[PDB]
Design a protein around this ligand. Structure first.
Ligand SMILES: Nc1ncnc2c1ncn2[C@@H]1O[C@H](COP(=O)(O)OP(=O)(O)OP(=O)(O)O)[C@@H](O)[C@H]1O
Ligand SMILES: [Mg+2]
Length: 382
């Protein structure tokens, strides 16, 4: 009937509500945003401050939709998120692969020993195989005698998840499921065509770099880094002697990811501390600090793609991501990301926004909303 998201981000908390229409298309009924205090690297850092932030967005969203919120789908990220790939097996009773046969094979590959510190988050079947026929998708009706699956397992640190759950539960809400941020950030920015050719998505944000790699129409790997937009924000402050509050504004209003797209005759007013006059500083100099960090950040994604690409072809599956890299999130909005990305990467870079948003489209237009609407796409499926 009604579905609710909750992207508890490192900087802003987004909360969307929508209703499932009979055909399937979900239209958004109400949005909600609020700055988040007490957050760092996608994890909880001050429990009482994030609880107030979650209530700020959930109350304004319950009001913009004329309905009471009771259950939510929440996102989750952090360096602790890890991915595993495990194979399984199963018999095909009465030579027809019924759905009861399909979950048994998944159950076998899913049942492993991980420990208590690890919490299972996603079990994503990649490519099936049915008697010398490999790489089949949805074989619901293929006559065979036995089948093996290659499930993709997403796991996260359990304790860091309990904190996020505790925050939402203290507002009278019930959590439905935890969702990896980059997975939702990919479900709402990608077209099915791009998935099959091969793509790399990255939720560039305040404190998290949520990477998801897709080849052959299946999620292959997921990795997260803790250096994000808050790193370049600090670099501006620490290099010019300007307060963090002011250094953020200079980043959003005059920041450039390449120190050659800005003209020498451009200047910015960077303030000072102590009671000093605000100096007028070259706009090129500002971009000269943002450029090295973005290159290093994308260098981590490049090193991740290469390590996944190597171990991918070495096992016999689609390895080269054709559609390229898709950038999203807040810190992907700076002028010149596609230019500095195309230098460190050598694949198709774009700054994809949420797609096919229905109704109330003015609040789900910018890429920093992708993770939020992606929670709706995931919740739409059951
Ligand atoms: N125009 C802009 N140019 C450069 N950076 C920007 C711009 N607008 C926003 N940002 C950066 O985007 C970041 C916020 O990202 P975003 O809102 O997507 O994160 P979030 O949802 O709060 O959390 P998460 O860390 O989990 O992605 C901030 O670090 C901010 O500096
Ligand atoms: Mg986010």
């Amino acid at each position: 009937n009604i579905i609710v998201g909750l992207d508890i981000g490192t900087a802003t908390v987004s909360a969307l509500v929508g209703e499932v229409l009979p055909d399937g298309q979900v239209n958004i009924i109400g949005a909600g945003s609020s700055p988040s205090r007490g957050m760092d690297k996608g994890g909880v850092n001050d429990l009482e401050s994030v609880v107030k932030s979650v209530q700020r967005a959930v109350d304004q969203a319950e009001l913009m939709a004329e309905c009471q919120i009771s259950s939510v789908f929440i996102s989750l990220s952090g360096k602790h998120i890890a991915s595993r790939i495990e194979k399984g097996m199963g018999t095909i009773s009465e030579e027809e692969v019924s759905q009861d046969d399909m979950d048994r094979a998944i159950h076998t590959a899913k049942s492993i020993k991980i420990g208590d510190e690890q919490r299972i988050l996603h079990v994503i079947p990649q490519e099936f195989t049915i008697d010398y026929q490999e790489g089949i998708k949805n074989p619901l009706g293929l006559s065979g005698v036995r089948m093996e699956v290659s499930v993709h397992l997403i796991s996260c640190h359990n304790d860091m998840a309990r904190n996020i759950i505790k925050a939402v539960e203290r507002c009278g809400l019930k959590v439905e499921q935890l969702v990896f941020s980059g997975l939702a950030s990919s479900n709402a920015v990608i077209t099915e065509d791009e998935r099959e050719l091969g793509v790399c998505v990255v939720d560039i944000g305040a404190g998290t770099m949520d990477i998801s790699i897709w080849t052959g129409g299946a999620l292959r790997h997921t990795e997260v880094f803790s250096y994000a937009g808050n790193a370049v924000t600090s670099d501006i402050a620490f290099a010019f002697g300007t307060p963090l509050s002011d250094a953020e504004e200079i980043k959003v209003k005059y920041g450039c990811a390449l120190s050659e797209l800005v003209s020498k005759d451009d200047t910015v007013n960077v303030p000072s501390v102590g009671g000093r006059p605000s100096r007028s500083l070259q706009r090129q100099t500002l971009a000269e600090v943002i450029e090295p960090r973005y290159t290093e950040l994308m260098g981590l994604v490049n090193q991740t793609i290469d390590n996944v690409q190597a171990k991918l072809r070495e096992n016999g599956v689609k390895h080269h991501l054709a559609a390229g890299v898709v950038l999203t999130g807040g810190a992907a909005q700076i002028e010149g990301v596609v230019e500095c990305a195309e230098r460190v990467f050598r694949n198709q870079v774009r700054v994809g926004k949420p797609l096919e948003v229905s109704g109330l489209t003015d609040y789900v237009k910018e890429p920093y909303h992708s993770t939020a609407v992606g929670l709706l796409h995931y919740a739409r499926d059951s």
